[PDB]
Amino acid sequence: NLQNIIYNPVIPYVGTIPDQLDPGTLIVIRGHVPSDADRFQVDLQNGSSMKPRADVAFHFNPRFKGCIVCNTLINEKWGREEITYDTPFKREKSFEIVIMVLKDKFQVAVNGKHTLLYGHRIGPEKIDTLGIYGKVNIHSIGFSFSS
Numbered sequence: 822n823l824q825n826i827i828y829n830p831v832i833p834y835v836g837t838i839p840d841q842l843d844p845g846t847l848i849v850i851r852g853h854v855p856s857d858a859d860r861f862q863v864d865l866q867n868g869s870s871m872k873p874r875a876d877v878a879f880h881f882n883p884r885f886k887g888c889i890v891c892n893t894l895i896n897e898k899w900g901r902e903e904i905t906y907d908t909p910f911k912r913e914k915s916f917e918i919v920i921m922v923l924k925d926k927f928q929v930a931v932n933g934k935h936t937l938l939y940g941h942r943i944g945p946e947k948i949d950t951l952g953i954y955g956k957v958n959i960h961s962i963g964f965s966f967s968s
């Protein structure tokens with residue numbers, strides 16, 4: 822039931838999500854971390870506005886020094902950071918990210934292994950845009966919708 826919408830998108834990638842993120846929806850992102858990476862992010866956004874900057878419902882931000890920082894941007898202001906230190910990401914290694922949308926939270930597994938949970942701060946129904954930024958190569962972006 823997984824239907825990819827784009828292959829090898831140029832980064833920064835900003836795209837419209839074709840259907841609503843209802844409970845049970847999956848977002849599947851397949852990529853690869855470059856040799857010189859410092860960090861990258863997957864942002865689930867409300868709109869693609871740049872001025873003013875669009876709210877980010879779910880900021881999923883792997884940093885390579887390593888860790889994953891998650892947060893929410895509302896009215897151009899960042900909320901409280903939720904930091905995961907048990908990170909599966911490494912440089913020169915490929916990955917598969919699966920984001921599960923649940924009623925009350927997102928659930929993320931990388932490479933088949935569970936990674937983290939993140940409670941909704943903005944109602945997921947307000948998400949219509951997917952943004953991927955920073956140092957990362959993306960092989961594919963797909964959705965399995967539950968509408």
Ligand SMILES: OC[C@H]1O[C@@H](O[C@H]2[C@H](O)[C@@H](O)[C@@H](O)O[C@@H]2CO)[C@H](O)[C@@H](O)[C@H]1O
Binds near residue numbers: 882890892899902
């Ligand atoms: O919370 C995610 C955002 O972090 C911002 O930087 C933080 C940094 O992570 C934290 O340790 C402390 O320095 O506060 C900073 C506020 O800017 C990034 O600038 C932003 O891109 C998000 O990743």
